[PDB]
Design a protein around this motif. Sequence first.
Motif, mmCIF file in Angstrom:
data_model
loop_
_atom_site.group_PDB
_atom_site.id
_atom_site.type_symbol
_atom_site.label_atom_id
_atom_site.label_comp_id
_atom_site.label_asym_id
_atom_site.label_seq_id
_atom_site.Cartn_x
_atom_site.Cartn_y
_atom_site.Cartn_z
ATOM 1 N N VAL C 9 9.243 11.010 9.907
ATOM 2 C CA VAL C 9 9.804 9.660 9.965
ATOM 3 C C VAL C 9 11.318 9.784 10.159
ATOM 4 O O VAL C 9 11.898 10.836 9.867
ATOM 5 N N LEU C 171 -7.264 -4.480 7.253
ATOM 6 C CA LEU C 171 -7.109 -3.169 6.644
ATOM 7 C C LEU C 171 -6.488 -3.450 5.280
ATOM 8 O O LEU C 171 -6.313 -4.602 4.873
ATOM 9 N N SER C 172 -6.140 -2.411 4.529
ATOM 10 C CA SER C 172 -5.302 -2.624 3.351
ATOM 11 C C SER C 172 -3.886 -2.811 3.869
ATOM 12 O O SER C 172 -3.086 -1.871 3.875
ATOM 13 N N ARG C 174 -0.687 -3.312 3.334
ATOM 14 C CA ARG C 174 -0.029 -3.110 2.052
ATOM 15 C C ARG C 174 1.128 -4.084 1.879
ATOM 16 O O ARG C 174 1.870 -4.369 2.819
ATOM 17 N N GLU C 219 1.925 -6.727 16.709
ATOM 18 C CA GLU C 219 1.337 -5.573 16.047
ATOM 19 C C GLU C 219 2.307 -4.952 15.054
ATOM 20 O O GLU C 219 3.438 -4.598 15.400
ATOM 21 N N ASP C 221 3.109 -1.975 12.072
ATOM 22 C CA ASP C 221 2.945 -0.528 12.059
ATOM 23 C C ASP C 221 2.399 -0.073 10.699
ATOM 24 O O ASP C 221 1.935 -0.876 9.885
ATOM 25 N N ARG C 222 2.438 1.239 10.459
ATOM 26 C CA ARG C 222 2.044 1.820 9.183
ATOM 27 C C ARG C 222 3.103 1.637 8.105
ATOM 28 O O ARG C 222 2.754 1.527 6.925
ATOM 29 N N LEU C 223 4.385 1.566 8.482
ATOM 30 C CA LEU C 223 5.462 1.285 7.535
ATOM 31 C C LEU C 223 5.506 -0.185 7.130
ATOM 32 O O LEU C 223 6.282 -0.552 6.237
ATOM 33 N N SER C 224 4.700 -1.033 7.773
ATOM 34 C CA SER C 224 4.695 -2.462 7.489
ATOM 35 C C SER C 224 4.198 -2.741 6.076
ATOM 36 O O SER C 224 3.003 -2.649 5.783
ATOM 37 N N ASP C 225 5.146 -3.079 5.202
ATOM 38 C CA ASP C 225 4.843 -3.396 3.807
ATOM 39 C C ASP C 225 5.692 -4.625 3.460
ATOM 40 O O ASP C 225 6.824 -4.495 2.997
ATOM 41 N N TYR D 124 0.904 5.254 14.839
ATOM 42 C CA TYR D 124 1.377 4.088 15.573
ATOM 43 C C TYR D 124 2.884 4.243 15.660
ATOM 44 O O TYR D 124 3.563 3.557 16.430
ATOM 45 N N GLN D 221 -10.869 -0.813 4.405
ATOM 46 C CA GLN D 221 -9.505 -1.323 4.478
ATOM 47 C C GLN D 221 -8.508 -0.189 4.275
ATOM 48 O O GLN D 221 -8.216 0.177 3.134
ATOM 49 N N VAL D 222 -7.942 0.319 5.367
ATOM 50 C CA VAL D 222 -7.036 1.466 5.309
ATOM 51 C C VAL D 222 -5.623 0.998 4.963
ATOM 52 O O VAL D 222 -5.197 -0.093 5.361
ATOM 53 N N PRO D 226 3.907 2.633 3.362
ATOM 54 C CA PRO D 226 5.160 2.880 4.090
ATOM 55 C C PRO D 226 5.638 4.322 4.005
ATOM 56 O O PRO D 226 6.710 4.601 3.461
#
Lengths: 218, 59, 371, 783, 87
Positions: C9, C171-172, C174, C219, C221-225, D124, D221-222, D226
Amino acid sequence: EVPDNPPNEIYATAQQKLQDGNWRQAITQLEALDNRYPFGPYSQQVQLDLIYAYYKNADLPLAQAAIDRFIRLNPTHPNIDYVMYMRGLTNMALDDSALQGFFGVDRSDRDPQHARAAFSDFSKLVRGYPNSQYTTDATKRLVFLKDRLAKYEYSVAEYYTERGAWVAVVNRVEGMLRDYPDTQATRDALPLMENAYRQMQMNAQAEKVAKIIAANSS
Amino acid sequence: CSSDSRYKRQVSGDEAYLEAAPLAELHAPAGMILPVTSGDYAIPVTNGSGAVGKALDIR
Amino acid sequence: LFNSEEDVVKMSPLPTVENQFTPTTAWSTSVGSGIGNFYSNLHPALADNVVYAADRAGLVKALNADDGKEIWSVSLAEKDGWFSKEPALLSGGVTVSGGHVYIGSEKAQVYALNTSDGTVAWQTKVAGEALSRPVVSDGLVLIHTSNGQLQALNEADGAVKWTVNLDMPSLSLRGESAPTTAFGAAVVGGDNGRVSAVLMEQGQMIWQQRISQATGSTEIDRLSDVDTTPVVVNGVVFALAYNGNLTALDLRSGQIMWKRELGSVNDFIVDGNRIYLVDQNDRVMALTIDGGVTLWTQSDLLHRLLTSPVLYNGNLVVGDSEGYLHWINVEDGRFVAQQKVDSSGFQTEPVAADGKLLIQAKDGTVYSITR
Amino acid sequence: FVVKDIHFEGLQRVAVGAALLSMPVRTGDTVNDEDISNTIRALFATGNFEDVRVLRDGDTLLVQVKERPTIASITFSGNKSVKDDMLKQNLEASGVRVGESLDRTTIADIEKGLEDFYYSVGKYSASVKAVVTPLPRNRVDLKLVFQEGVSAEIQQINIVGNHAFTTDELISHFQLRDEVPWWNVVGDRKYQKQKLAGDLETLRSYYLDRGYARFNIDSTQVSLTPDKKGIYVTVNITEGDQYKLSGVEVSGNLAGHSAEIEQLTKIEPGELYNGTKVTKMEDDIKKLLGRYGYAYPRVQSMPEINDADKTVKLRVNVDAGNRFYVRKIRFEGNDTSKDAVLRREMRQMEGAWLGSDLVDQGKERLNRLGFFETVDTDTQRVPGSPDQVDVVYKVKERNTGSFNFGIGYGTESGVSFQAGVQQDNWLGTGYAVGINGTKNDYQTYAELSVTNPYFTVDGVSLGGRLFYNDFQADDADLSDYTNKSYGTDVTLGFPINEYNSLRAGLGYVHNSLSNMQPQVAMWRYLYSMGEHPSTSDQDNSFKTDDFTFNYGWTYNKLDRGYFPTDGSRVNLTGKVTIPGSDNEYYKVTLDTATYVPIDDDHKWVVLGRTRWGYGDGLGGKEMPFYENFYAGGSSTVRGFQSNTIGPKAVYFPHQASNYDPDYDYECATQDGAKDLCKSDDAVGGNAMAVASLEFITPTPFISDKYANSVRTSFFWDMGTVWDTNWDSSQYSGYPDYSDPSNIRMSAGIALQWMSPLGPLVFSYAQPFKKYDGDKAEQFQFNI
Amino acid sequence: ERVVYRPDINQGNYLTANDVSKIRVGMTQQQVAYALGTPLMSDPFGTNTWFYVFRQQPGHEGVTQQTLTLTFNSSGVLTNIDNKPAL
C-alpha cells in the motif's frame, strides 16, 4: 523492417521485395502499408501479393489468413478464383508433405484433414469460377484430393477387414463407393465388403458385390 | 545459408498432387448399383484454363 | 519469487509534529492486543470512573479511570463458539448501559457483561457478525450487521425483539453501519451507500434515500471503510454514503437540506456549523451546516488513517492508524500537539471521557491521554 | 444553403463518401446551420473523428476534421507481474487497439475497465491512466501506466450460523502458506474470489455426505478491511440437520438392466446421507448404460428429504438411450501415422453397441502411446439415429524416434563410426524400431532391436533383439581384452492384466574372449568358473555360450506415454540360467518410476526413481563379471564420467601380455608396474543400489507452451554399487565392496529438450561425495 | 496351431431374440425403428434389408455369429426377418 512512409513507398518496398524473393522483407512492407493505413488501393492486390509472399515463403497458415484478409476485407477483386486457387493449393501442401518422397515413403495413410479442405477450396474454384485461369491446375490436384481422401478411407476399410469388424468394412467401402466414383482403391475397397458379407453370411449380397467387380472391372 | 560445396538438387521433394488425373470410372451393374457420385468427390471438372498444379502464375 | 509476487500500500507521512501543549499520557492501561489489524468495530467504554475495556481475544477489563487498573478483569474466552474458550473476536464494540457491558462478538453474539464484575448477565445471538457496535438504547440492543440486518435484542434480559433487513452490505462493506435512534426511528445509514429512518419501536422503514452507490457503478475499493451511520444535528440527518458522499437531509422524511454527495468522507463530526471530517486523504476539513462550505481544512496529517476528529484539552483531537495523536486547531488546521503514545495505531475513535482521552490502539491497547 | 462542394479534411480510416454519407449536408443536399450542427455530431458518430469543424463558403462546405485512426502503438508500464496482453484485452474491450481507430471517450474505459480487470485478479488496489501520445498524420499511442497498489490474500473466513456442525472443520478443506520475511521466504496465499467460489461449494460437499440435506449458506460477505489485502468473509450459513439415505426408488428407463442398476444403487438404508455417494450412484448407472450401448443415460436421483424420521429416500430417475450407439468412429489428427496403428490401439469396435469403457481404454492405450500429444475425440451423434453415434477421435500425434551417438571426434582416424537411432512407430506402423552399433578401430558392434507390438490384436507384442559385438579393444591386437559377444533375446509382451503385465525372455549369451585383463576380480570369477587363468599375462581365453532365461514384470499405474505427471510404474526384469548354459547363475533387477505432485498443479512433481539389482550363482558358480553392475556419469547419478561407480579391481603382477603395447595401456604389464597394481576402473559388483531424485519444475521465462515439454529438473543424485561376493582378502589393501555402503553422490540439474527428435536431456552436475575410482566430468550431456 | 487359449474378438450390431418378437412381417421400417432403431448396416443395392449381424470368436475355439436381417419391401413394410445363427 518497415520505414514509416506513405503506404505507396511501403508498397514500393513491398513489390520490389516481392521481386527480391525476400518475402520476409516483402510481408513486412505488404502488411505495414495497410497497418498504419488500412485504405490501400492495392490492398486486394496486397492480399494477392501477401499470399504470393506467403506461399513462396511457405506461410500456408498466413496464406490462409491472407485469404480471410482478402475475403472479409476486399473480395472486390475477381481474383477470388486466384484466392480459390491459393486456398485449394495452400491447404494441399499444409496437409501432408515431407522430404521423404524421393523413393516413395508413405504420406496418404496419414490424416487428409486439410486435404479435405484443399479439395473443397479447389472445388470452390472449379464451381465458383469454372472457366477461370486456375480450374485446370485445381482439377489435377482435386483428383489427388479425392483419391488420397479415398485411400485414407481405404486405409480405414483395410483394417476392419483385418480386425474382423465386417460391418465396419461395409460401412467403409460403400461410403468410399458413394463418395469416390472413379478411384481404383474404391475398386480395391470393393471385394472387402463382399468378403465382409461372406464372413457375415451375406454371400448373396457379396456375390452382388462380386457382380459389381464384374462391371467395375471396366 | 548454403552448402560450402555449393551443391544443391539432391532431392526432389513431394509434388504428387500436381499431376493426378481421374482414374478408371466405376460402372455399377443394374440391380447391384450404388450411387457413386453422392459426395463432391465426383469432381466438378470444368472448362477452365491454365497450367497444372502450383507452376501456374501467382499474382 | 514470493519477495516479488507480493505488493504494498502507499501512504504519506505526518508533517508538523507539535508539543506546544505538551501531550502526555493520562495513564497507560493496556488490555492486550485489542481491535487487531482486521478492522473490528470494537471500541471500549468508560463509565463510573471505570473504563470497561475489552479486546477481541476475550479479556474484558474494567480500568479504574485514574490509573486504568482493572476493577474486574474477566475473559470472553468463548463459551458457545465452535471450541470452548475460543477468542471472543468482538465485532461489535463495548456498550455499557446499566449493568451490562454489551459487546458484539463475531459468533453473531452480543455478550452483555454485568459491569460490576464483567460476568455475562445475558448474551443473545444476532444474524451475522457485527458491522456495528451494539447500539443499546430504548430497551433495544441495535446492531446493523454485515447482512444488513437491524437486530433488536432486548436490553436488560436479552431477547431478539426483531431482526429486520436494512441497506444491505453485499460483502462485509466494512464501516459503522449502525442504527441510531432518532425521533422514534432508528435512523440508520447502511454500508452500501444509503441513509434511512427505520421506526425504532418495531423496525419500520420511515424513508430511505439512495445517497450514493457502493460495490457497483461508483466502485469502492478494499480500503473503503466509511460510516453511513447518521450524526443527526438540528433534526437534519448529517450522514454519508459508503463512498463518503456527505449529505444533510431531514430526519423523518429524508429531504436533502444540503449535500456534499460526491464526498470522500471517512469519519465526520458536526461541530456546530463546522463539520469536521476525515476525507479519504485522511485529512481534516470543516464544512458548514447550510452547505459544505469549507470554513477551514488541514492536510498536516496526510494519509495518516485518522480516527474521528474529537475535541479534547482545548484542541481538535484525532488519532491515526500509525499511532500519532494530533491536537488540531478547531479553526484552520494547526497541530497544537502531537502524541505518538502508540505506533500500532488507533482503530478506536478517541473516548474523550473523564477529562482524559481514553484511546485503545489495535495492539498497543488502551491508553489514556492528557496534555 | 445548398452545398456545391465539401472539403473533406483528414480521415485516415474513413472514406470521402463515408464522411459524406455521415454528413447530412452531403454534396447536393441542402445546407442549414442546424444541418451543419447535425454534421459535427454525425461525423463524431463515425467514432474516428477527434474533432470536426463543419464550416462553409456560403454553402460550399469546408469540413475541418481532426481524427483518431490508427493507434500506432500502445505502451505498457508499471505491470510487474500482470502481462500486457491481460492489459490489452480490456483495452480491446473498450474498442481500441494498435492499428485501429482510437476513441477518446474510451480512454477511461480502458482504465477503470482495467481496474475492473484488476478487481477480478484478487486486487482492486490499482489505477490505470491511458495517456494518448499522438503520432504523425493523425496517429496516436496509448501510453498505459499501471499504478497497481496491492492484491489481496485470504486472511480469515468467518463462517456464521453453524454450531452443530462446527465451523473449524469447515475451514479444514483450505490451504495456504506463511513466513515471507525476506530471509525465510515460504510460499504465498493470494486471494481469489473464484477460488472462494470453489471454497464455498467445497463446504457444501463437506456437509452433503454427512447427512446434511438441509445445509445451506445464508449469505457470504467479504471484508473491505482497510489494509487492501484483508480478506475476512462473513459467511452466514444454515448447517441443517443430518439425514439418512434410507431407501432407493430407482425408476425410469433402466433399459432392461434393472438389477445391475439396483446393484449400483445399493445403499445402507439409514446410512448418514451421502449426497456425494448419491452423486456417485447416478453416474454409476451412466457408465453401465454407456457400456450397454446407451450414450445418453439420463440418470436423476431425487433424494426426497424425509424430515419426519430425519431420513431421505432416493428417487432415482434413469433414462438410457437406445441399443447401439457406435455406428462408426473417425480418426483425425494422424498426419504422421496410419489410422490402423491407432485402431489397433483402440478397443471400441464399430458395428456394435457402444462400450463406453471400450472407447476410453483404447484412448488410454493412446494415452500411453507416446507418439501422441493429446487424446481427444468428437463422439458426435449421427442425427436422427437412436442406434448411431460417430466418434471422431481428433487426437494430436507426436514425432517418432530419436538419435544417439557417443563418438569424441570424427575425420581424425580410420574408418570408424558410432551409430544408433530410433524409428519406433516406423513411418506410422507402431513398430518399435531402434538399432545401434559401432564398427570402430577397437570393435565392430552391431545390435538390433525391433518389436511387432501387435502380432495379434490382443496386445501380443512380438519384440526381438539381436546383438553381435566383434570387440577386441584393439590396443595393439587381441592381447588386451578381446570380448566377442553375440546372441539374441526375442520376447513377447502380453497383458495378463493391463496394469500387471508380464515379461519373459531367453538370453543366448555366446561370448568369445581371449587375453582378458590381469585383474584380480577378473580372474576370481574365472577361478569360480573352474578355470585357472594366468595372473602374469593377458593370454587366457574365455568362451562362454551362456543359455539364460530372462523374466520380468510391468506395473502400469501412470498416466501418459510421453510426459507423465502422476502415478507409478514398477518395472521388474531379471534372469536365471538353465542346464546347458556355460555358467549356472541368476541375476534379478527392478526399477520403478513414481510420480507424486508436490502441489496438485502437477508441475511440481516428485519423480521417484531408484535402481536395485542382485545376482549370484545358481549353485557352485557365480553371476559373471561381465554381469556386474555399473554407474557413473551420463546416468541417473551423473556428473561423474561413464562407468566410474562400482567395485574396483587390481591388476595382478603382470607381464608382456602377448605384448601389451610398449608403455601404452600399462596394466601392471612388462611396461612398468610389475606388481599387484591398483586398478581404478569399475569392475562392478553383483549388486546395485543407485537412484535419481529429480523434480518437475515450472519455468516462468521458458514459455509453458514448452516449459511443460522442457522438464527443468534439479537433482541431488547419489548411489552406490557394491559386490556382495567381494573378496576382502584379495583386496585387503584395496577398495573393498563387501559393504553395501560405498556412497557416491553428484548434484546438479538436467535440461530435457523436447526437440523434433523428441526429448533431449543435457546436464551439469558437481560431485560432492565420491568414492574409489570415480572419474568426473561435471558436464554430462545425453543425446 | 498349438494355441491353448486366445483373447476373444467381438462385434455386435445385432437384433436380440426379443427384437424379433417386437417386429413382424408386414411391419413398417419405422415401427421397427421406434424400438430397434437403425441398423449399423443395410442393403446398399437391393430392397430395404436391415442387417443386424453379430460376430465373435471364443478364443480360437471356432467362431460364433448371429446374422439377423430385416428384409422390408421398398415401402419399408417388413417382408422377412431372417435370423441366422453361428456359421
